[model samples]
Target: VKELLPPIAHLYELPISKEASGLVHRTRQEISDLVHGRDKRLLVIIGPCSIHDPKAALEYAERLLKLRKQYENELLIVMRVYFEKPRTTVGWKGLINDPHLDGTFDINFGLRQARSLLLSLNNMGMPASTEFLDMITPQYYADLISWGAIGARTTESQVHRQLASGLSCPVGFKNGTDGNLKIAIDAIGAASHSHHFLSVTKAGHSAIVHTGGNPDCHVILRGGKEPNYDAEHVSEAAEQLRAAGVTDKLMIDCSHANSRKDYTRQMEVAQDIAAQLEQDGGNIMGVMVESHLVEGRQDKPEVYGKSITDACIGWGATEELLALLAGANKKRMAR
Candidate 1:
């Protein structure tokens, strides 16, 4: 066995304040409602590719917070604050795995910083969304998360499906890397059923995790060898969900292959998704965007707001697209 790491309780011991706590609860409920059709507004999960620099992260957060207020009525905005990144081969895992751009893996320090950042954002009434790539890591910061995601590579995994069953927030499972939607649909169905698995309790004790199952799980299309955010793909996905008897609503990841991996192409995909929503307000419930303060990727990252990981749309483009989506939905509401 490996060396004993600090229990989850050690992290919760540094919990957020009372005010942040309230927003965390309210936002999660609102997100659940929005996912299930109880709320009509569009859910937009937009932020950096990953949180590398906390200072820059907060700077982006501040602007996003203002946009939240500006478009609160038409958009349910949740800042994507992903700390753990799933990789294909091997590299820097994420902020949690290597907080220092150097090579030192200071997980304890990383966890504290991640939790504090979420608390800081929640304190300002901005909801945060993250992908749960690590099974045990969620126990550390999931209470503050508003929405969760199971990434494309892990959608067919039984462990992820079981993990989603017990997650406290609505979870989106992405299609398989090859662009298979059925696996994600099946994952949504699996995660919505009861599962008993091994997990650690809040007290850091070994326990059998009994879950009543999560009904708020949906699918996200992140593209594969080719882009799948087109209307034909979305329509086919909707029909698949209908046949499976799951909710027809799905989410679109405008980054990854869907944007042809070009940060600038996300705008086209976003505009198309908006136009589709405007047409009928059909099965699309939400969209995901990789956005940062700056427009592209950098090695040295001399810029303050630029992303060091995947290239992202700059803040200007992000705001423009978000506004466009809101206006489209506004037209839908009026119709």
Candidate 2:
């Protein structure tokens, strides 16, 4: 009923280089500063909804790296290298669950593929981020992550809160699928405190894990039955965070309910947030966009760079939006 897989240590055979390690460390600190308001730059996390193909992911990373360099002053760009996809019912989990996009869940191969890709990304000097869906998978690749996200479905899960507490980098907990922000605000409060939990070690043995508490935990508003990315909603969310005794800064996902699952609307949502940043740069810390090299999604994609899960904005629009966001941040900085 179960299959034995390689330990996290075994995966270390394909390791991140010393220079890459430094990049991960520094990027983590930089993100922490951004989340805590010590850094004024807007944190922009953009990439595919789920990375089913490493080749396309790398190509996207190459293009994004150039933008990261160009927008270094106004925006903090982190590539979304998601490997696991949480489902409402059941479907293709993700690269680490089903890398081939077929029924054969070759998880061992998937783990290696995920780790190898992370190694290549960091080595290329591009910082990466991912949603921590499986609690155990982080052992395989958490060292390379600059930032972490808990999806809307799992934001209120206690296990995810514990995992975020122990995570080395800044973590963002999304509002619930129903558009409730209190659960995410509560998760932020919970994850900011130390906790003891049971998990597997790098040696793949069951162990008890103790966390020092993650102060960089923040909230992400992904919307619900209605979009909540407008100025009024954002101000309300910030007040809720302030009342909840957590950091008031928050991020917004341009996809999901915010865009009503329409990928093209992500650009519109980003423009709205950009306008907010331009006028009254308050507690809006960052934004997330589901994007890929190509626009739209296909169930069985034959195309090179299109997504297979959620529909995403293509590269051209991604390029244009990044510039617009950077300009908005620049205007905010000028104020």
Candidate 3:
């Protein structure tokens, strides 16, 4: 009493050039290096709140391509091309759930579109990041993602920890939605060890999946009901991470509760982190910014580049912040 979707192999056979494969592979390695302290540059994951339009996502990626090269030496930039959105209760899931803005959820079409967009972005030489919300969704397109995340809502879920264990790229686990750091830190420790779970195979068969565990997992501080992006919170997070025997490095989300859900406040959060980088005092190894070609968000988006989910910083502001971060890192190296 169920509908069967196309197998992962079938979707993967659609179209992907050799150049795109190489680019994604190389970018993933660079991200892993950054996560493990092999790379000294700051890692920045930035893009729209959620990718509802492939056209807009590409437009944003092209703009970011220029910035990635501009700050290539000082920062490793990954475009956050998220396809699945985790909801607190329930709403429009995301592009991969409903490719059409309409209510009819044609997930097969959604999967194809998502992979096609990732293929296009990779071929254009961009590193992409995404959050893996479901156990099965990753099989559809996880290979193309250069970096991964376990969102705030699922940070404490044992299911997600198992998902992170098998994920290929560096995965970041955000603190709990209520700003609880211990659970996310515990998730890291859990994901760093081997685990066996039931998952679908590439052939779309229900199979038992086993993982050797992932060492490239880290923490992302996205704040909770109260903002925790301050220096004191970040310091406490790092200390706890070390105490848990996980990587003490942190990635700050300049959006979300950190800015109190106000788009204008992202700059201030980014600026504060930039200052921390200036003195090179924080345990932060990366930053996450929700940014799009346009400034704010809308319920029914009339504009192409504007966000449809949480409000995002505009491209002009995003460009300035990238410069600020690169400049801060440059000074840190000089010091």
Candidate 4:
């Protein structure tokens, strides 16, 4: 039976150790405080779009861990440990789909590697986050995660909303690729209530799923076909949340369709948003950036292990932009 499964299937999945479980619970509570505005702290979800090189990821994590400790007072930093990439129509799936980076699909290996990486990250004291595309995969590594995201493409899906409803950590639903805010509102509402749905247990057992309801879910505005991170966009999104009886605070992603899906312009958009947040304090939560070891993007086809999926901003640019944002937040606080 195991031989027929994906590559991640090759590795054994041990129950989360008692130490790790305690750490996850503590981290989740802290993150919830930030998301709900109970604590005056900003939340940042930053890292590569997709991880293909474990060593490189660890190296990046080491750098961020230091920075996170330095800025723990004003920020709740979560490392982006994305392993799945949703496809609109046609493209490479994700590391879990094709871990080999070749045309061959060896998900078996991918799962093992993904789990090992998550455990390693959590053990290092960095809260890991990822977009949960495949619902069933959560059983493999959810214990090690501190945050979750429902991507733009999946925000409106009943499946994803239910997933968020039952998720243990704070979850974010991105605005529709078309700049629609209502869908995100629905997500926020749905995630805040209890749900009775069908799901399997972590022990490979099937049963009815009951969720206590997730109240800390928020919205993420990543402009789609057209840009939507302007003041108008934020105001309208905030208003919608209020109408839905939720917090007005929300995150603005500077990449993806918001920046026209270009890594170069993400900086421009981020700078503008940060400046506005500083000059005029509004219901802005924080921001999300897709960044890697290098700037721009490289093709996986050109060379294996270059990038598994999605383009990301390079490290130098990411660091500089983050510094600017931190400075902007600092100015806002001073006022």
Candidate 5:
């Protein structure tokens, strides 16, 4: 029982402009440099948990673009334009899977919608970041992504590692759900090596994809049973990375377990991260925050800018946190 959809090439009709293409390329390199310790700016990946409404996401992006420029020197801002959601049990997948927010999975429409939104965001000079859940989705719109993430649930997945190995953008693998950094560290190591895997091409043909390996992969500490975003946890994580001989740089997720899944707590987590940066910014490369136009989550969203999935900090708090992180990075730079 399967239905046929248009090939990835079909989505090319909503193409990326030359300016957007250059922006994607330049931002990918910039993020790679930041991950590799060549860039002094702190990478900040902030936006909605999952993009349900393109209009709302765009509104958030416009506001974020202002802050991106405001903290351009101390922070490298990337919009979290996620389109896929991995569920632990039966639930709504994401924009690319269930764009309508109903049981009707208009996937083809969702794909087009996702790609078109990315086109709009990149053309506006706002770099986009997302988690790669469906392996085949990248063929549709990965060209526009500047930074990618392998979520905590999929960090230890072999297939995800293979996908990360070939992704065009810098990828971050999160620590395991149980707070195990070893899995993510090992995933990073695995993704850094060449691999041959089966996947569909843009032409929609099944083929064995050979990858040259991704060197810009890093680990994201999102916490497990307890929060691992503190200085002790971060230092231990860095030590483990060093022992494994992978890149010792890491990114901290201010939401999820670190914030105890409390939307407002993300601000406190971000504050702690800022202090870490000011004290010793050597090991920390970036930060990820779950945020949106409004604060908190709704089962059935009555408000336009609020989130439907994970609770996120509102726009006002997001602004203050960015400024705080930027100031901390400035102090780090001074040292």
Candidate 6:
């Protein structure tokens, strides 16, 4: 007798949104072309760390879209439309857990809302990104994402490595939470090779997925208990890749553990990196900043969609810092 399958088995095999996936494909090319310098503009992915409020997200994108044109020569701004948050212990999972933020889980709706936001951004001609989590989760929404990332916690997972291998977009893997480079390096290596693995289908069914590993996979230095994105750390990471015979590039995250995990310290680190970029313009690739319409964070109280996860820089601070980075690039050119 044949084995019985679940109702979800059917959903897994069925695919959704051909057009949505196409939008994702277009966004990837635009950024890849920019990063590779078919267009020479800095790639700056700026937004709230984790989006809990779509209205806030929509407005934030509106402001950023204007800047996209204002400084076309200096930056390619991609909104960090992150939804899932990974915690070592436990806390409110994210908007996905409770879109209401008052303890009502509406994940199904959250997924739909998140994807809708991505589509809307794509429609606005603004590229979007987020951490690729829950493995099978992407089958539901990856079609709308422009760039993808494997965060520190999950970068070493075989599932994540495999998923990234199959993704067509340029994916970034963050260094481990402890600041170790090996796991992330291993992730890059695993992602660089084709592999067959378990994956979900379009209708959200289970299936065997095979991939021809991604060559565009690269490193993101977010620091940890110690900083790993400084000049020596950056050079050391590049050297590690050189020793490993890998040609993948690197991007620096001046936030997170690199900033001592304090939202204020993140700005200081941003200034420091910008200074370094101005003095020497090579191997910096790009920078990741956690900014919003507000600087710092507020306690989650269901207060009209304030951040329920991490603290972020407000719009004013975010704008100022980005302008500084763009000016730094100009200064380097002046030399």
168-222, model 6: which lDDT tens digit per residue?
A: 7888899888888888888888998999888766654678888998877777889
- lDDT for 177 in candidate 2 is 96
lDDT by candidate, in order shown? 0.87, 0.90, 0.87, 0.80, 0.91, 0.75
Question: Mind giving the per-residue lDDT tens digits that candidate 5 earns over 1-335?
Answer: 45646455446588779998999999999999988888778899999998999999989999999999989999999999999988879789998887899888888888888888999999888999999999887888898899999999999999999999999899999998889999999998999999998999888778998999999999999989999999999889889999999888899999988999888899889889888888885899999999999999998868999998999999899989999999999999888
Off by over 4 Å in 3: none
lDDT tens string, model 3, 14-114? 55578877877888788777777776688899999899999989989999999999999999999999888977788888998898989888887888888
TM-score of 5: 0.98
RMSD vs true structure, all candidates: 1.6, 1.1, 1.4, 2.5, 1.1, 4.0
Candidate 1, backbone clash total: 0
Estimated TM-score for each candidate: 0.95, 0.98, 0.96, 0.92, 0.98, 0.89
Model 2: CA > 4 A from native: none
Question: Candidate 4 residues 206-225, lDDT tens each?
Answer: 67998999988999988877
Sequence-dependent TM-score of model 4: 0.92
User: How far out, in Å, is residue 97 in model 4?
Assistant: 2.1
User: Candidate 1 residues 162-225, lDDT tens each?
Assistant: 9999988899999988889899999989999999999877655778988989999999999999
TM-score-superior candidate, 2 or 6: 2
